[PDB]
Design a protein around this ligand. Structure first.
Ligand code: CLA
Ligand code: CLA
Ligand code: CLA
Ligand code: CLA
Ligand code: CLA
Ligand code: CLA
Ligand code: CLA
Ligand code: CLA
Ligand SMILES: CC(=CC=C/C(C)=C/C=C/C=C(C)/C=C/C=C(C)/C=C/C1=C(C)CCCC1(C)C)/C=C/C1=C(C)CCCC1(C)C
Ligand SMILES: CC(=CC=C/C(C)=C/C=C/C=C(C)\C=C\C=C(C)\C=C\C1=C(C)CCCC1(C)C)/C=C/C1=C(C)CCCC1(C)C
Ligand SMILES: CC1=C(C/C=C(\C)CCC[C@H](C)CCC[C@@H](C)CCCC(C)C)C(=O)c2ccccc2C1=O
Lengths: 176, 730, 154, 42, 166
């Protein structure tokens, strides 16, 4: 008769979202962009074809020293000061709560009108395409599936097989 | 409760200490209520003082069994499929030795996985799929892989019928509280329309697809996935497309036939699973009845009728409250369901109904003891729940002066007899054996009770067995052999790998087990009978229906005043039955191998797993560990480093778990309290205990953790003891 | 070295175990997998207990008669970490089981009605008092015996 | 969404997603090192 | 009760001794790196004096020194239950007398003090750790290695090595 059913962070799920998704931006347009036959070709010789490999797992380290740094700073002062104990304001804390952060300390604040209001108008822009980005990428992340599963010949694994017409993979279009 | 009752919250009850009688789980902390909660979780003296719901729950939380039996079976069809051995075994039976399960070689594991047939590593089976599965008017591994999801289909759906009850706003009273039709339906068309429907898919398809299997081929060199339609052309080999008959009746001519059936009895030479040319006819000949039968009726009338002098005035009226009980109409059932399961356990071993059983020894005795512990674990129950009636179920006393009010009238009486019955037995029914020891260890055989010393003379024969295998010359039509090959008269030739069934002789060492059963079956029942009877009132305590059918024990007075009750009569009645069944098992295999199971070769000089050692030597009750327990079991205690090994390697635990029961069975209670504090003390010093007042076991919980263990101990012990002396020689 | 025999560098009795026993494993002249892709005695299960050759590492490891290996651990000749190495390990792991036992416990008995908060769990595992254990340098080895759990509270 | 001074609850047996698993990851160390009986160190 | 800490004395002095000995420990290494060539364990002996006798042994050496370290150390004890060390620049620091806005108890966070001219035990704070965790570092990497930094020919780029031990 209808589920009971949740939330409350019902308020937070929505901000790894704008994380996950905006993000898929990075993959969506650069791929297809790629640049068909640019002129063409993809060749990367440079730091890469002669200095004994370049990355992979020095890859990650350097690679997400940064993501490191920044992804942390991301949610853990998104906002929340007050930052300790001890009775309920809910989110699972707002144990920042009634105090934002400081009683007349510094400029905790951005912007006049005693709050943080990045002004009133802009529902526009990002309500739309952006929690789009959430939606969009559901289906061209459901393309990731279509785009490659079928492990282009070069392997049948656990042999059912299980019938046979012809191949599959990606580049755009479809026979139909 | 109290919480929001109203009308005024969908908002569900997640959070606020307790529920279940009313100075309930109290604010104040404790542990007992965590075995409370699970125990008695299902019960009815709480939930509401008003029938209504309960039947509205039990018709739902029922459901999730079927659905389950249904998630189960799937992982068994799947399993009996892609974890194959079934394909391999079928082209190649007499030969294989089947599997479905296999480990994954993590840690020690693998030893458990040991070459089983059509060329692979795994752990065997004594659960005769691969043999219902003969059936498959089709064959194919991925196929069972449809029967399989066909299973998960029935489930999710035959499990959303349980959403589609209680949780959905439910039916009510009339619906069940009009009973008027129920069996009308059930037996007519399902009981019927299955057995019926089973007929149609038991000659259509199966018969033919093992009519010409019982020879050779490799499947798909036979039985396509459709092939068996309109094409009534292969049905040509296995009788006419009725040729000139039209819908039975008589203006029919046979100058040479009589439709499929042409009744058998005996056993296929090449697949002694009993004939199938019959198996249609018998299911057909069922259903009809059910088909005709489930057509009563509407109730009282028939029971409101035949009374007499001493007979049952209350016979007439034998329960309005048999539409208003459950606990009653469950307990009745269990006695039948239960007692109607272990009647399986015979007609099976002395009349196999599946291709390749008997030859398959271990893959139908497992059976005959699994089926055997239900036709018993369901019967003590079938008493418990009557006790549950006898104490409470009805509102007041509206039920009066009848068949019962009668039986009770005598009660220090029906159980007055029965008692002496047992000590008459016991003395004629066990010390009987003890004679032997005392006098064969004294040693003077002249005077034992041997199948040969005390007067009986090289024959048993003249009774009724010998007028069974020989009855195809009465009103009997006939059909070579009997009904069950194990009967006195005629025939031999049964099977070309190993053996199957043959006569099975008697006299003494068959005479007296058969009697220990009596005395064992009887004193079991004494304690359940007197238990359920004296349910509510007595001249040790009359103020004795005042809590429930459990209650620990009334109190140190009256002398003893402890066991009493009837949870407990259904606690010491399990205690016996564990024997009742545990010694009946002990019986069958020692016979069935001492004689029967054994084996042909030239001149079919028969060679039993044991040249009948039974003879003169079960009669001694040591012979029962000379010839049994110490003889066989030498396969359990040799079983290390092998493939089965998981048995020997259980047989120590579970032969431990039992020898842990006694601690739960044999001990006080403010004991483990008195102890649990010393503990609770040391706890507080570090500051580590109080919250959730740790407490010892709830007098009768304690008995709950006896018993249950004593059985899952004392039982799998043999479940191991067994699978380890039929796998491997036998 | 000590009462049993010497390690792996030589242990005759031990050798015979390697060999019969396992390898009989063999035992199946064939049993069909000429090329076939399942039945894995064949590869490892042996070789994973087997390629465990005249190497097992080398571990010292004393090996008595029948050459099943015995554990001394008296902290000498070679055998030290057959108890201590995996001993302090048992200590450190437990104690940081119950350091937090005496923690997602000593954090409750207060505020408002705290009478079974524990049949549900406030922070699962405690996931707050969590690391207090690896975040034990020294810890109870001082603050247990001085203050808090202080003889007072004793 | 969880900051400082204890958090949100959990069920009766989340121990059955703690016996199974965590512990379960440990066979996962008992095949990476498919063997023990002493141990090299790091 | 003792709400909370505490401590004090305690293990703030706990540290500084780590700090300032991890600092020294690394003077240890300092040596073999510029005009380089000579170290690792090098299980010294450790610098070794004259050509007039030792000779492998004359004596346990090593073993002694620290019998000494030993009553000097009872001495720093011989201080911290009851404050006695003229300078007085560890136990809180010097700047004689003071800091002990934490010597009679009641801290919570208490930052501290202690140079007359001038500034602090502070940016001797963080050489304080750089070196404790450095060691962590230092006899981290042996257990496979022992040397730093050439140029851009073919060194600083990590080429091929060899697990952990395993
Ligand atoms: C048609 C049958 C069936 C049904 C629907 C019921 C239903 C009921 N019975 Mg019942 N009963 C039955 C057959 C049935 N019984 C049989 C055959 C017996 C004979 C043993 C009994 C003996 C019995 C007693 C003595 C009692 C009931 C009670 C009840 C009521 C309590 C239910 C409950 O809380 O679950 C109880 C189940 C548990 C709490 C789970 C514990 C199960 C343990 C013991 C495990 C079993 C061992 C197994 C190997 C362990 C799993 C494997 C492990 C090693 C991993 C309920 C109305 C109780 C009552 O008070 O009436 C209102 C009373 O206790 N029954
Ligand atoms: C966090 C818990 C905790 C702690 C610190 C202790 C500590 C102690 N117990 Mg103990 N105990 C516990 C839980 C605990 N117990 C539980 C749950 C039981 C089952 C009733 C017992 C049953 C028990 C008995 C019978 C005895 C002790 C004894 C003792 C003392 C001896 C230690 C020993 O060798 O037993 C080893 C510890 C056990 C057998 C306990 C098993 C339970 C452990 C694994 C708890 C693990 C944490 C648990 C999951 C909590 C959840 C975490 C939560 C924060 C989210 C010691 C003071 C002995 C004593 O009184 O002498 C001083 C005595 O013999 N205990
Ligand atoms: C460099 C850093 C490292 C660090 C410190 C973080 C830290 C964080 N990431 Mg993250 N991430 C990383 C690498 C890292 N990431 C990498 C390499 C990828 C692949 C590109 C991602 C892809 C990713 C996604 C999609 C998201 C995060 C999110 C987050 C935040 C919550 C993480 C979480 O699930 O809780 C851990 C909880 C457990 C129960 C364990 C957190 C601040 C999420 C977020 O936005 O939350 C605010 C979510 O959006 N990350
Ligand atoms: C074959 C067995 C079986 C079946 C069909 C059931 C069925 C049921 N049990 Mg139950 N139970 C069982 C074995 C079984 N139990 C055993 C062995 C125990 C241990 C004592 C219990 C202890 C127990 C308790 C305490 C309760 C129930 C309850 C229930 C009912 C609640 C359904 C629900 O709320 O959402 C269904 C929810 C899901 C499918 C969610 C997924 C959860 C996992 C486990 C899957 C349902 C009738 C509740 C009741 O009183 O209803 C009658 C009650 O709270 N059971
Ligand atoms: C009646 C049974 C129940 C039981 C006791 C098992 C038991 C088992 N299944 Mg299983 N299974 C079941 C129902 C069951 N299954 C159902 C209904 C399905 C359909 C989804 C499956 C589909 C399935 C697969 C695909 C596998 C198992 C496997 C296994 C083995 C490992 C399963 C596991 O959980 O950890 C392990 C184990 C013997 C594993 C196996 O086949 O190889 C050992 C394999 O993983 N099962
Ligand atoms: C209690 C009372 C009342 C009485 C006094 C009797 C008496 C008798 N019934 Mg009876 N009966 C009764 C009510 C009664 N019945 C009721 C209500 C029913 C239906 C529930 C029956 C159903 C019934 C059957 C089926 C039989 C009897 C038989 C008998 C007779 C036993 C044979 C005998 O002794 O001669 C034998 C003497 C020789 C010397 C030989 C005996 C005369 C039996 C009978 O017909 O006689 C054998 C037969 O077994 N009764
Ligand atoms: C152990 C006992 C008991 C049982 C279970 C049976 C069972 C059977 N007897 Mg039987 N019989 C018995 C005692 C028993 N008998 C005694 C004591 C005698 C004489 C003293 C006979 C004399 C006898 C004869 C002459 C015949 C049978 C036949 C039969 C079988 C045919 C089924 C039938 O007609 O009814 C159907 C019942 C149900 C469906 C239920 C069936 C297997 C017949 C047979 O099998 O011959 C081939 C044959 O006609 N019996
Ligand atoms: C006045 C002198 C000088 C100074 C500044 C100190 C200072 C100190 N001594 Mg000490 N000591 C001294 C002379 C001194 N000692 C001499 C001459 C001896 C001869 C034994 C000692 C023997 C001694 C011992 C055994 C110890 C100290 C300890 C200490 C330290 C703890 C304070 C204490 O225990 O007082 C004692 C306070 C009292 C009130 C004494 C009680 C007097 C009787 C009547 C009671 C402290 C740094 C302790 C220490 O540092 O251990 C880690 C302890 O080990 N001293
Ligand atoms: C719906 C249907 C049906 C059917 C059919 C059916 C409905 C069938 C069924 C059957 C059933 C059966 C056949 C049963 C079975 C059972 C089983 C198999 C079980 C077994 C067991 C035992 C023995 C005990 C317990 C355990 C187990 C479970 C294992 C149909 C309907 C109809 C209609 C209306 C329309 C037209 C057509 C028709 C057709 C006329
Ligand atoms: C010691 C042990 C165990 C033992 C055990 C033993 C020593 C025994 C056991 C047993 C069990 C059982 C036993 C269960 C079960 C089961 C089953 C599954 C059954 C089945 C069956 C049926 C179906 C019915 C009847 C028959 C039979 C039984 C077959 C353990 C220990 C431990 C430790 C150290 C610590 C931690 C935890 C652990 C890890 C835990
Ligand atoms: C031994 C014995 C006891 C003592 C038995 C006890 C106390 C068993 C209960 C022990 C519980 C089951 C331990 C539960 C603790 C764990 C569930 C907590 C930690 C959770 C896990 C992660 C380990 C009785 O209480 C008793 C009562 C009546 C008749 C006979 C006896 C009897 O024989």
């Amino acid at each position: 008769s209808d589920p009971e059913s949740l939330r409350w962070n019902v308020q937070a799920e929505l901000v790894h979202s704008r994380w996950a998704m905006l993000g898929a931006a990075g993959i969506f347009i650069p791929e297809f962009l790629t640049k068909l036959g640019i002129l063409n070709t993809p060749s990367w010789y440079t730091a890469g074809e002669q200095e004994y490999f370049t990355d992979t797992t020095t890859l990650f380290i350097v690679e997400l020293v940064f993501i490191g740094w920044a992804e942390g700073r991301r949610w853990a002062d998104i906002l929340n000061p007050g930052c300790v104990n001890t009775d309920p304001i809910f989110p699972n804390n707002k144990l920042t709560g009634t105090d934002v952060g400081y009683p007349g300390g510094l400029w905790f604040d951005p912007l006049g009108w005693g709050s943080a209001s990045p002004q009133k108008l802009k529902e526009l822009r990002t309500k739309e395409i952006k929690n789009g980005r959430l939606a969009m990428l559901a289906v061209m992340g459901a393309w990731f599936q279509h785009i490659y599963t079928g492990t282009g010949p070069i392997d049948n694994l656990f042999a059912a097989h299980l019938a046979d017409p012809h191949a599959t993979i990606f580049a755009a279009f479809t026979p139909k | 409760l109290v919480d929001r009752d109203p009308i005024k919250t969908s908002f569900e009850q997640w959070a606020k200490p307790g529920h279940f009688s009313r100075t309930i789980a109290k604010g104040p902390d404790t542990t007992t209520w965590i075995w409370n909660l699970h125990a008695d979780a299902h019960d009815f003296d709480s939930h509401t003082s008003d029938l209504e719901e309960i039947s509205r729950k039990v018709f739902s939380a029922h459901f999730g069994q079927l659905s389950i039996i249904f998630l189960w079976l799937s992982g068994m069809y799947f399993h009996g499929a892609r974890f194959s051995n079934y394909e391999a075994w079928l082209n190649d039976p007499t030969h294989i030795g089947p599997s479905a399960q296999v480990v994954w070689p993590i840690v020690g594991q693998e030893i458990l996985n040991g070459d089983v047939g059509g060329g692979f590593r795994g752990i065997q089976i004594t659960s005769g799929f691969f043999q219902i599965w003969r059936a498959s008017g089709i064959t194919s591994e991925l196929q069972l892989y449809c029967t399989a999801i066909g299973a998960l289909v029935f489930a999710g759906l035959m499990l959303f019928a349980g959403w589609f009850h209680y949780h959905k706003a439910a039916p009510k009273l009339a619906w069940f509280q009009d009973v008027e039709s129920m069996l009308n339906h059930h037996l007519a068309g399902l009981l019927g329309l299955g057995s019926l429907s089973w007929a149609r898919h038991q000659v259509h398809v199966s018969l033919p697809i093992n009519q010409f299997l019982n020879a050779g081929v490799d499947p798909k060199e036979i039985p396509l996935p459709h092939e068996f339609i309109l094409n009534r052309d292969l049905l040509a080999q296995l009788y006419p497309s009725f040729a000139e008959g039209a819908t039975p009746f008589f203006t029919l001519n046979w100058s040479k036939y009589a439709d499929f059936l042409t009744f058998r009895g005996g056993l296929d030479p090449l697949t002694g699973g009993l004939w199938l040319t019959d198996i249609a006819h018998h299911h057909l000949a069922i259903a009809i009845l059910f088909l005709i039968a489930g057509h009563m009726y509407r109730i009282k009338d028939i029971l409101e009728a035949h009374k007499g002098p001493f007979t049952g005035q209350g016979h007439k009226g034998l329960y309005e409250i048999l539409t208003t009980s459950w606990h009653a109409q469950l307990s009745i059932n269990l006695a039948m369901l239960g007692s109607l399961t272990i009647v399986v356990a015979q007609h099976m071993y002395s009349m196999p109904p599946y291709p390749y059983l008997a030859t398959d020894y271990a893959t139908q005795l497992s059976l005959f003891t699994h089926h055997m512990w239900i036709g018993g674990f369901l019967i003590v129950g079938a008493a418990a729940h009557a006790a549950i009636f006898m104490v409470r179920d009805y509102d007041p006393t509206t039920r009066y002066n009848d068949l019962l009010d009668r039986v009770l009238r005598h009660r220090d009486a029906i159980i007055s007899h029965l008692n002496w019955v047992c000590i008459f037995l016991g003395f004629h029914s066990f010390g009987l054996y003890i004679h032997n020891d005392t006098m064969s260890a004294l040693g003077r055989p002249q005077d034992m009770f041997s199948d040969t010393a005390i007067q009986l003379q090289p024959v048993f024969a003249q009774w009724i067995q010998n007028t069974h295998a020989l009855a195809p010359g009465t009103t009997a039509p006939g059909a070579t052999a009997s009904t069950s090959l194990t009967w006195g008269g005629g025939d031999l030739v049964a099977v070309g790998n190993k053996v199957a069934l043959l006569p099975i002789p008697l006299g003494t060492a068959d005479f007296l087990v058969h009697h220990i059963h009596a005395f064992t079956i009887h004193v079991t029942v004494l304690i359940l009978l007197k238990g359920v009877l004296f349910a509510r009132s007595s001249r040790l305590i009359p103020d004795k229906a005042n809590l429930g059918f459990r209650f620990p024990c009334d109190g140190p007075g009256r002398g003893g005043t402890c066991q009493v009750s009837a949870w407990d009569h259904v606690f010491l009645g399990l205690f016996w039955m564990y024997n009742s069944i545990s010694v009946v098992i002990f019986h069958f295999s020692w016979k069935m191998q001492s004689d029967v199971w054994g084996t042909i070769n030239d001149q079919g000089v028969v060679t039993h797993i044991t040249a009948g050692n039974f003879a003169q030597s079960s009669i001694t009750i040591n012979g029962w560990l000379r010839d049994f327990l110490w003889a066989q079991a030498s396969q359990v205690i040799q079983s290390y480093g092998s493939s089965l090994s998981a048995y020997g390697l259980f047989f120590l635990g579970a032969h431990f778990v039992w020898a842990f029961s006694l601690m739960f069975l044999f001990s006080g209670r403010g004991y483990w309290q008195e102890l649990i504090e010393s503990i609770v003390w040391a706890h507080n010093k570090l500051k580590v205990a109080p919250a959730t007042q740790p407490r010892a076991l709830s007098i009768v919980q304690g008995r709950a953790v006896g018993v249950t263990h004593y059985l899952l101990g004392g039982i799998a012990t043999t479940w191991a003891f067994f699978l380890a002396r039929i796998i491997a020689v036998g | 070295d000590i009462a049993g025999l010497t390690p792996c560098k030589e242990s005759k009795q031990f050798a015979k175990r390697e060999k019969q026993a396992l390898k009989k494993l063999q035992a199946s002249l064939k049993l069909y997998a000429d090329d076939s892709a399942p039945a894995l005695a064949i590869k490892a299960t042996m070789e994973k207990t087997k390629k465990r050759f005249d190497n097992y590492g080398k571990y010292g490891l004393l090996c008595g008669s029948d050459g099943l290996p015995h554990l001394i651990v008296s902290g000498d000749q070679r055998h030290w970490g057959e108890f201590i190495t995996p001993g302090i390990l048992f200590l450190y792991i437990a104690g940081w089981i119950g350091w937090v036992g005496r923690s997602y416990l000593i954090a409750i008995r207060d505020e408002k009605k705290p009478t079974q908060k524990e049949i549900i769990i406030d922070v699962p595992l405690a996931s707050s008092l969590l690391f207090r254990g690896f975040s034990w340098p020294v810890a109870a080895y001082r603050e247990l015996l001085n203050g808090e759990l202080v003889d007072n509270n004793f | 969404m969880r900051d400082f001074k204890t958090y949100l609850s959990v069920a009766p047996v989340l121990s059955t997603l703690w016996f199974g698993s965590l512990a379960g990851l440990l066979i996962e160390i008992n095949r990476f090192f498919p063997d023990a009986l002493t141990f090299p160190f790091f | 009760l003792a709400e909370d800490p505490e401590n004090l004395r305690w293990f703030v002095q706990a540290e500084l001794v780590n700090g300032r000995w991890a600092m020294l420990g690394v003077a240890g290494m300092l040596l073999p790196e510029v005009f380089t060539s000579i170290g690792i364990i090098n299980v010294p002996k450790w610098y070794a004096a004259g050509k007039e006798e030792y000779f492998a042994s004359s004596s346990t050496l090593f073993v002694i020194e620290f019998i000494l370290s030993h009553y000097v150390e009872i001495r720093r004890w011989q201080d911290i239950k009851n404050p006695g060390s003229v300078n007085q620049d560890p136990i809180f620091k010097q700047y004689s007398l003071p800091a002990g806005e934490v010597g009679y108890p009641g801290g919570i966070f208490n930052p501290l003090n202690f140079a007359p001219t001038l500034e602090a035990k502070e940016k001797e704070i963080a050489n304080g750790r750089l070196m404790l965790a450095f060691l962590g570092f230092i006899i981290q990497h042996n257990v496979t290695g022992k040397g730093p930094f050439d140029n851009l020919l073919q060194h600083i780029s990590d080429p091929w090595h060899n697990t952990i031990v395993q």
